[PDB]
Amino acid sequence: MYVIVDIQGQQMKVEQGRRLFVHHIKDVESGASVEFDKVLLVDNNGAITVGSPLVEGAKVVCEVLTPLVKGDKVLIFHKKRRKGYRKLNGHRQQFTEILVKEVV
Amino acid sequence: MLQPKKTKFRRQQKGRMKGFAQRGNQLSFGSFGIKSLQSKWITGRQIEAARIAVTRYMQRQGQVWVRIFPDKPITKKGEGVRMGKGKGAPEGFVAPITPGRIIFEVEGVPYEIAKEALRLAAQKLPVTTKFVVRHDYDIQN
Amino acid sequence: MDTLSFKTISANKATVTKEWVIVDAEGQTLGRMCAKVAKLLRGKYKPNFTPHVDCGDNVIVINADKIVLSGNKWDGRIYLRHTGYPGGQRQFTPRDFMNKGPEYLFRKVVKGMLPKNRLGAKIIGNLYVYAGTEHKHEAQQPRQLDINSL
Amino acid sequence: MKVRASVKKECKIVRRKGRLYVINKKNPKYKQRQG
Amino acid sequence: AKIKIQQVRSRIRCPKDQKRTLDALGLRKLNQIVEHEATPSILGMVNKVRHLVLIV
Amino acid sequence: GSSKNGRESESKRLGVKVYGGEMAKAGNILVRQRGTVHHPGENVGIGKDHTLYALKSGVVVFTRKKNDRSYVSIKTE
RNA sequence: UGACCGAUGGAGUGAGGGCAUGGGUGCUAAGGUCCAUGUCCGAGAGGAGAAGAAUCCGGACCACCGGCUAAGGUCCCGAAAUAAUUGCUAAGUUGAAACGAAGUCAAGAAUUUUGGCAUGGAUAAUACACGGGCAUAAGCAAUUUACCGAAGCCGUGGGAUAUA
Numbered sequence: 001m002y003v004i005v006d007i008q009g010q011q012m013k014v015e016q017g018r019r020l021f022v023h024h025i026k027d028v029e030s031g032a033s034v035e036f037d038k039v040l041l042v043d044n045n046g047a048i049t050v051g052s053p054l055v056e057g058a059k060v061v062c063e064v065l066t067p068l069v070k071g072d073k074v075l076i077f078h079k080k081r082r083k084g085y086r087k088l089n090g091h092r093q094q095f096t097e098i099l100v101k102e103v104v
Numbered sequence: 105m106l107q108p109k110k111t112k113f114r115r116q117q118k119g120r121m122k123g124f125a126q127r128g129n130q131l132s133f134g135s136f137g138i139k140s141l142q143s144k145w146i147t148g149r150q151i152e153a154a155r156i157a158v159t160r161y162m163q164r165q166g167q168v169w170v171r172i173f174p175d176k177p178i179t180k181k182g183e184g185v186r187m188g189k190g191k192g193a194p195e196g197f198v199a200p201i202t203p204g205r206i207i208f209e210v211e212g213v214p215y216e217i218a219k220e221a222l223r224l225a226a227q228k229l230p231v232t233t234k235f236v237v238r239h240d241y242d243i244q245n
Numbered sequence: 246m247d248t249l250s251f252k253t254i255s256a257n258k259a260t261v262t263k264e265w266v267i268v269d270a271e272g273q274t275l276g277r278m279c280a281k282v283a284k285l286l287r288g289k290y291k292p293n294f295t296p297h298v299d300c301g302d303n304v305i306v307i308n309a310d311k312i313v314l315s316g317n318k319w320d321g322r323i324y325l326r327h328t329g330y331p332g333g334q335r336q337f338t339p340r341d342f343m344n345k346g347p348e349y350l351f352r353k354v355v356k357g358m359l360p361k362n363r364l365g366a367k368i369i370g371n372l373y374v375y376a377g378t379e380h381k382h383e384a385q386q387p388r389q390l391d392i393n394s395l
Numbered sequence: 396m397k398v399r400a401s402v403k404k405e406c407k408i409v410r411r412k413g414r415l416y417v418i419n420k421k422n423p424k425y426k427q428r429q430g
Numbered sequence: 431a432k433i434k435i436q437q438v439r440s441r442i443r444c445p446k447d448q449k450r451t452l453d454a455l456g457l458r459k460l461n462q463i464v465e466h467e468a469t470p471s472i473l474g475m476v477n478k479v480r481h482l483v484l485i486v
Numbered sequence: 487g488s489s490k491n492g493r494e495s496e497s498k499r500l501g502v503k504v505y506g507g508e509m510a511k512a513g514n515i516l517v518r519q520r521g522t523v524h525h526p527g528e529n530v531g532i533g534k535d536h537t538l539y540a541l542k543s544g545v546v547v548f549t550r551k552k553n554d555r556s557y558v559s560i561k562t563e
Numbered sequence: 564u565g566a567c568c569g570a571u572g573g574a575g576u577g578a579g580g581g582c583a584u585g586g587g588u589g590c591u592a593a594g595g596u597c598c599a600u601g602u603c604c605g606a607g608a609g610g611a612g613a614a615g616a617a618u619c620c621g622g623a624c625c626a627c628c629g630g631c632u633a634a635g636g637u638c639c640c641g642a643a644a645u646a647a648u649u650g651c652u653a654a655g656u657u658g659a660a661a662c663g664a665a666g667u668c669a670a671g672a673a674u675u676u677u678g679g680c681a682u683g684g685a686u687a688a689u690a691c692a693c694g695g696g697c698a699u700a701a702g703c704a705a706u707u708u709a710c711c712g713a714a715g716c717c718g719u720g721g722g723a724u725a726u727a
């Protein structure tokens with residue numbers, strides 16, 4: 001059983017007990033229960049349902065394991081040759097890790 | 105040469121020919137004629153060549169009118185002369201013409217060879233032409 | 246560390262699904278048939294297509310001499326080449342290629358619709374062109390394909 | 396045989412191999428090419 | 431009464447009087463929608479920038 | 487060759503400074519002209535160089551009459 | 564909108580250039596030169612045009628393996644229609660003129676005019692071009708619908724700078 005559902009504006013394929021990384025969810029704690037009810041597809045080991053106005057009654061319950069996971073550093077470099085303009089910044093994307101408990 | 109005897113100023117600015125002729129586009133004084141389809145300067149040498157061509161044909165009957173007169177003076181710089189330092193040497197006169205202006209016209213002549221005399225005249229001009237006839241002319245003279 | 250957790254998988258040498266197909270050139274146009282053959286060789290018809298892997302099909306073309314060139318192309322299309330010496334430009338025609346052999350004409354057309362790199366140079370070797378309907382490709386069990394369906 | 400940009404016509408105008416000809420077998424000094 | 435004007439084309443290479451008309455209407459971004467009373471002055475601005483806007 | 491030309495004089499900034507309908511004060515210059523292109527009327531004076539000015543405050547009025555002559559006057563109160 | 568105006572601290576610039584329009588000059592030449600009104604390059608990245616400073620679209624805070632579009636496109640190299648319908652072209656035209664036949668379709672009038680598409684005029688030196696394969700449509704003209712297509716717009720996460 002797997003469902004296609006979107007979490008923070010991005011669609012993911014999820015099963016039971018998966019340990020996803022999603023875009024940062026603000027004001028949460030370790031062990032907090034988050035809910036996402038915008039499933040687009042449900043595949044129950046052979047039976048497939050597709051929802052135009054989502055799939056009615058479908059639901060994904062998750063628990064927060066880490067409230068702030070930072071990604072790998074990316075160097076941001078701007079340069080225009082022969083003009084002297086040059087700057088170099090650093091960026092780290094922010095994620096939260098969740099574990100999926102029940103897939104309705 | 106076909107040119108004025110006197111002018112107030114010896115020099116003239118090169119203007120801009122703009123649209124279609126709003127005068128001198130209808131046939132007065134005559135029966136057959138040619139109109140120009142393009143905008144151009146016409147030299148007196150070209151005009152005299154065209155008139156000589158149209159009058160060698162047609163023998164000497166009928167009447168021939170040229171309806172443009174060259175009165176715009178033009179200059180030319182010369183060989184080895186660089187840009188600047190005023191206007192160049194005079195090089196005659198030209199007539200500026202626009203589309204729809206009647207250049208040559210003929211009268212008192214059979215249609216079938218007026219059509220040929222005017223074509224002979226029009227082959228010695230730097231503009232494309234169009235044959236025109238009076239809107240009251242009848243086949244039986 | 247990896248924060249993606251939902252990736253698109255690329256096929257590799259052990260995961261491709263390579264097949265032998267047989268297509269016919271009985272009355273098809275040369276360029277129109279060869280474009281579909283190039284798509285077959287590249288693997289554009291497979292849902293696991295991967296542009297950095299040889300993931301296409303081995304194609305056998307039969308009845309190659311029955312191919313059709315419209316217009317005056319059989320002698321009016323001038324191919325030019327150069328020997329590298331001064332005054333060394335030469336001309337030839339699709340008729341000259343056909344006289345030499347249909348496989349040469351088909352290879353010349355398909356190389357030109359294939360990508361211009363090492364992978365395409367490897368791909369062009371998966372094509373087999375035969376003049377008649379008789380060819381010897383046992384032990385691989387090729388599958389007949391209707392090129393007009395594509 | 397005379398070749399000129401504008402060819403014109405008992406001489407007859409024919410088209411051969413994408414070229415224009417004006418031919419007259421009675422008088423061969425009036426043949427023309429490339430109309 | 432109230433009408434809706436949406437900018438659909440870029441202001442790049444347009445003359446400054448047209449750019450200032452867009453500012454006076456209140457459009458500073460592509461695909462932006464503003465709402466205004468259909469007074470003759472507003473209609474005149476819309477006429478001036480008609481090739482850049484859509485009435486939605 | 488050489489050119490026998492190349493001379494000019496400075497422009498004199500002539501023209502109408504205060505148009506019809508505007509408010510003028512006493513002594514304001516209304517028109518700069520060469521000759522009486524416009525003529526003085528009520529409460530409008532003319533200077534040495536034919537400059538039109540307002541004797542009193544008020545509103546500038548331009549009016550035309552016979553011979554298409556143009557007059558400039560000040561309407562007060 | 565918000566930066567218009569005053570007063571004060573600090574400047575840089577005072578070699579410009581392309582395109583469009585109105586002109587002068589030149590030869591109604593020049594990637595020429597001198598002015599005026601706009602715009603862009605200068606100081607401007609991204610997309611299409613094969614490859615191009617200023618032609619067409621479009622102004623880049625950072626990240627994303629999300630979505631919609633612009634110009635321009637949807638046979639293969641190369642993302643998306645070998646989509647649908649109606650005509651024209653036979654020249655591989657396609658993806659430079661006076662001046663000649665009129666090859667062909669269409670609309671007329673009393674031989675003749677009229678436009679559409681072609682054809683001859685049409686031309687030098689290391690090997691040549693629709694970018695290439697190649698195409699009789701995958702050319703040209705018209706219409707309709709889907710789709711592709713950018714750092715433009717929207718979505719999600721994260722910063723910064725001001726006005727309230």
Ligand SMILES: [K+]
Nearest residue numbers: 612613614694
């Ligand atoms: K090109």
Ligand SMILES: [K+]
Nearest residue numbers: 637641642643
């Ligand atoms: K494609």
Ligand SMILES: [Mg+2]
Nearest residue numbers: 495496497498
């Ligand atoms: Mg003066």
Ligand SMILES: [Mg+2]
Nearest residue numbers: 576577578579
């Ligand atoms: Mg200086």
Ligand SMILES: [Mg+2]
Nearest residue numbers: 576577578579
């Ligand atoms: Mg200077």
Ligand SMILES: [Mg+2]
Nearest residue numbers: 580594595596
């Ligand atoms: Mg210059």
Ligand SMILES: [Mg+2]
Nearest residue numbers: 592593594595
């Ligand atoms: Mg110029």
Ligand SMILES: [Mg+2]
Nearest residue numbers: 578579605606
């Ligand atoms: Mg500089």
Ligand SMILES: [Mg+2]
Nearest residue numbers: 603604606607
């Ligand atoms: Mg700029």
Ligand SMILES: [Mg+2]
Nearest residue numbers: 608609610621
């Ligand atoms: Mg660019």
Ligand SMILES: [Mg+2]
Nearest residue numbers: 631632710711
């Ligand atoms: Mg879309």
Ligand SMILES: [Mg+2]
Nearest residue numbers: 712713714715
């Ligand atoms: Mg994008």
Ligand SMILES: [Mg+2]
Nearest residue numbers: 623714715716
């Ligand atoms: Mg943006």
Ligand code: NA
Nearest residue numbers: 492493494495
């Ligand atoms: Na001067």
